[PDB]
Amino acid sequence: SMNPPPPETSNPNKPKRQTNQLQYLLRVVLKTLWKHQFAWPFQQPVDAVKLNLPDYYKIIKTPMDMGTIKKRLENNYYWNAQECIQDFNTMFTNCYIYNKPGDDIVLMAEALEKLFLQKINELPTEE
Numbered sequence: 001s002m003n004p005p006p007p008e009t010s011n012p013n014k015p016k017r018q019t020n021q022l023q024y025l026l027r028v029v030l031k032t033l034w035k036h037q038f039a040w041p042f043q044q045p046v047d048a049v050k051l052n053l054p055d056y057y058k059i060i061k062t063p064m065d066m067g068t069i070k071k072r073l074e075n076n077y078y079w080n081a082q083e084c085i086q087d088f089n090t091m092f093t094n095c096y097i098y099n100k101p102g103d104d105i106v107l108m109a110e111a112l113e114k115l116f117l118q119k120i121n122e123l124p125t126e127e
């Protein structure tokens with residue numbers, strides 16, 4: 001198939017708040033993963049047309065990427081910090097669903113996920 005529209009990154013029908021957790025998720029978690037040498041395949045939605053991966057969006061029905069997550073944080077899309085953490089988890093899980101052990105892309109996800117866990121370890125306390 002072709003590509004779906006990217007996930008929504010704003011919600012007009014949802015109140016917005018600033019929290020220590022959410023700001024940390026942008027400025028520490030997202031930012032540190034973003035600058036990693038293996039971040040690039042996860043910085044934007046998988047372009048299945050350009051990459052000639054016709055089955056990607058047949059297999060992956062809940063796509064997620066760090067470009068989307070970054071915009072969601074900047075736009076205050078998330079009310080609860082867990083919403084953001086869930087999106088990271090979905091991104092990694094998609095990679096482990098679609099690909100095979102030892103694939104380049106899988107090793108890249110593994111390094112990012114390792115780093116992600118190190119960073120969310122020091123997430124500020126809620127509320």
Ligand SMILES: CCc1c(C(=O)Nc2cc(S(=O)(=O)N(CC)CC)ccc2O)[nH]c(C)c1C(N)=O
Pocket residue numbers: 040041042044045046047050051094095098099105
């Ligand atoms: C390996 C395919 C893949 C990617 C990916 O994005 N790969 C990719 C992107 C471009 S790119 O043209 O879009 N590009 C210019 C360099 C990036 C801006 C070029 C080559 C590429 O291999 N991401 C995921 C989660 C997967 C997967 N299999 O799960």
Ligand code: NA
Pocket residue numbers: 054
């Ligand atoms: Na084809």
